[PDB]
From TrEMBL, chain B:
Cu(2+) 8 binds at H352, H397. Cu(2+) 5 binds at H121, D229, Q297. Cu(2+) 6 binds at H326. Cu(2+) 3 binds at H50, H443. This is Twin-arginine translocation signal domain-containing protein. One of its GO terms (molecular function) is metal ion binding. Cu(2+) 2 binds at H50, E203, H443. InterPro entries: Host-pathogen_enzymatic-act, N2O_reductase_N, Quino_amine_DH_bsu, TAT_signal, TAT_signal_bac_arc, WD40/YVTN_repeat-like_dom_sf. Its cofactor is Cu cation. The keyword DNA-binding does not apply.
Length: 464, 463
């Protein structure tokens, strides 16, 4: 009886978005029941590509909890191989606040309509549980929002000016990244970025597809200006957040106290630890790069904040580690280790999404490949920075969460929106898969509802 | 966990999602979802994925096909989702989907091809080469040929009340008219796509049969609704039983010449049957002096010798006929009625069913509105007594069984808003072995058959 397996897992609620299913759901891992779900198209969102999410601390998640889940829109419908005849996809890019009340989900608000900012990639909660960030890699905008007031705390645009305007060499041969703090342009203090407004490229750079833009496979109005912002992850000690830009392979560290970028960490192995940021106007900063060696994927801080990880991808596939023990000065954060493996020397697998154990001693990293190679989970020693093991799971692996007692990693794989999908559970003492639960979802995320701010240190806050 | 799934065997579960808009296949041997499809990705803007049946495949893991249909229109507005949509998609599609060992492929929309948009139960024929679909807003059913995607037969069923007052329109009886339909558009197409033909604006929801007489359902032909629900097949061949929920009748059709032959009356205390009189080359009538209670699901046992029909709401019971005479459905007589004092209220309703392959037991869901736990009744199908009731979860729907007869698999659906899942029950102990998570509002579920014999225990002989 599976109840014996569920009794081991504990009282934890898994949230998942469905990508092309258009759903979001919560599953009680102590009983195997789905507690509630919501289907975006029921509400008249005609292109509900439910993408990323983060949940806030709830002292008792079974009585109620809240979360943010966002969507993509426009031509993002057409890039996963589904033979649809749709000609006019919905504009999408919604950011929804959803509250579970102990019985059902309630769609509380559409923060993208309220604020004017439609952003479609990672959603992260702040370490205090009272705000959240959302980034978008077609618009290259991110923003932090106050949850209670459903308002914008700050929003920034990041732009690339390539050294070589040749699309194939626009990143390799370097460029200048310009960071601008945005101000609302419409009545009510609203921004003008709903739906597809602001997209530099007509659809996202898909998993494993960062070089598709330079290889001429993605259309858009400002192709050589894209940086592909992906997430803003938070130092659990406070003060700093890290904005990942996939194409230049940089993590820009912002000071959340005065909302300014302070240094840019450079992913690639062999490249400097960081580059400086120069303030050039009241609201504008720049970073200059003489070259870009490789794009990058996901970033994260360890639970104590003293390590920061950034995954180089495609041209290099490795885990880059900085010593971030100096909380006072991120200009002093230096590369300390790089995890590499002879099996990672091809274009794939990419070192992808991560989750640390609460004690910080191990980090679990998904290994992504295109069809048909089985995707998996790498287990890394987060003290000596060594690969310990790799386990195969299934096609199209995405994110990992962990139960807050440290005992089980929970991941999702998503079938490239058309083949096998599921929720995988891994025991962190044996590092073996306990098994798979069925899942109708193309999830690119998953979160376990936290009870406390200390749980956010191992949630969709410190890492993606 | 591997221990858990290993017990079940290599059986694939298909589910539709209702308000999720999806259909999915789950491999019960590993826990993996093999493939899913989201209707709205194809431009179906109101994909209320409702009912389904799968056809026998020699190796489901390499490929199989099934039909899944949808509802549409204001059916979006009746499960308490606070949507601001004003113009819901027309829906009422009938999709043929093929798994190819990797993914689902949307093959065709048989509603667009034929012009018959029908949104309630889908049943495979016993030989696996055709399927029926009924609709309880339009009160039409049709049997289709799979290979040519064409209509074999189509009927309309209508009510003429004795008492035109809507509260009395069924209680005081009426005449049920059955008419063979013919296509009205060029190219042999019917004119029933979308909401065309709806006598009421949305379906009578689970447990909600008396909502129409209670004035809770808009539409232009309220007092003429019978709420056809499904066409289930005698596994011995020849006969099919069309259930009409509001008169509480199961009309038996001869598939050979497509005529109705006898009408079984569900209610306890009522005759076994009423005769069906021919009044024109394409028209038959059944006259009822009263309707005692509405009815729900119907089914034949695997050997065809028993037929069940669930009375609901005014009576909640399992009516059982002796159908052992295959030659003559006018000899089919009431032989037993399964009752329990705990079913004396309006709820629970005795609902969907599955029999064990050897015909020894039948599992019957027990439906209630929120917040009462819904469950499974286990019934001894030799002496027609209730053995056990087990509580599962809110809003229980259908049941399937693995073809080796070892596990009943069911779904519960949260009223489209609260808890849902897949439940697996061991048929030796009659205990629940586990719940698996499911993002679904499913009103159906099927395990992909390998043979025609498997259809005796699938979405063919019963709902
Ligand atoms: Cl904070
Ligand atoms: Cl047949
Ligand atoms: Cu993604
Ligand atoms: Cu239904």
């Amino acid at each position: 009886k599976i109840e014996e397996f569920y009794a081991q897992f504990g009282k934890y609620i898994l949230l998942v978005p469905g990508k092309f299913t258009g759903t979001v759901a919560a599953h009680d891992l102590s009983t195997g029941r789905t507690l509630a779900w919501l289907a975006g198209w029921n509400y008249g969102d005609t292109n509900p590509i439910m993408h990323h999410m983060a949940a806030f601390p709830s002292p008792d998640p079974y009585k109620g909890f809240e979360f943010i889940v966002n969507t993509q829109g426009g031509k993002n419908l057409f890039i996963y191989g589904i033979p649809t005849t749709v000609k006019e996809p919905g504009e999408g890019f919604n950011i929804y606040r959803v509250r579970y009340d102990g019985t059902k989900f309630n769609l509380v608000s559409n923060i993208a309509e309220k604020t004017g900012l439609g952003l479609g990639v990672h959603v992260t909660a702040t370490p205090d549980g009272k705000g959240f960030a959302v980034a978008d890699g077609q618009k290259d905008i991110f923003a932090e929002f106050d949850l209670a007031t459903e308002s914008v705390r700050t929003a920034f645009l990041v732009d690339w000016k390539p050294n070589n305007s040749d699309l194939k060499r626009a990143w390799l041969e370097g460029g200048t990244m310009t960071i601008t703090r945005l101000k609302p342009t419409l009545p009510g203090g609203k921004y003008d970025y709903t739906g597809t407004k602001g997209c530099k490229i007509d659809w996202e750079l898909v998993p494993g597809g960062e070089l598709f833009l330079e290889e001429g496979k993605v259309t858009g109005t400002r192709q050589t200006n894209v940086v592909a912002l992906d997430a803003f992850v938070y130092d659990p000690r406070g003060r700093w957040g890290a904005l990942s830009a996939r194409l230049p392979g940089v993590a820009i560290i912002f000071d959340r106290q005065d909302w300014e970028p302070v240094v840019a960490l450079v992913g690639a192995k062999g490249e400097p630890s960081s580059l400086p940021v120069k303030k050039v106007a009241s609201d504008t900063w720049e970073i200059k790069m003489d070259k870009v060696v490789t794009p990058a994927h996901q970033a994260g801080f360890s639970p104590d904040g003293k390590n920061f990880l950034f995954m180089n991808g495609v041209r290099q596939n490795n885990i880059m580690v900085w010593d971030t023990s100096n909380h006072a000065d991120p200009t002093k954060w230096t590369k300390k280790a790089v995890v590499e493996d002879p099996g990672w020397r091809g274009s794939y697998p990419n070192t992808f999404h991560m989750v640390f154990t609460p004690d910080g001693r191990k980090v679990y990293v998904t290994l992504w490949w295109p069809s048909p190679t089985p995707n998996g989970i790498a287990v890394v020693d987060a003290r000596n920075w060594k690969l310990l093991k790799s386990v195969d799971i299934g096609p199209d692996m995405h994110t990992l969460a962990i139960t807050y007692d440290g005992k089980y990693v929970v991941g999702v794989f998503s079938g490239y929106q058309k083949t096998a999908s599921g929720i995988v559970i891994m025991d962190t003492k044996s590092d073996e898969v306990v098994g798979i639960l069925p899942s109708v979802g193309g999830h690119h995320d998953c979160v376990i509802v936290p009870k406390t701010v200390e749980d956010l240190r191992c949630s969709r806050c410190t890492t993606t």
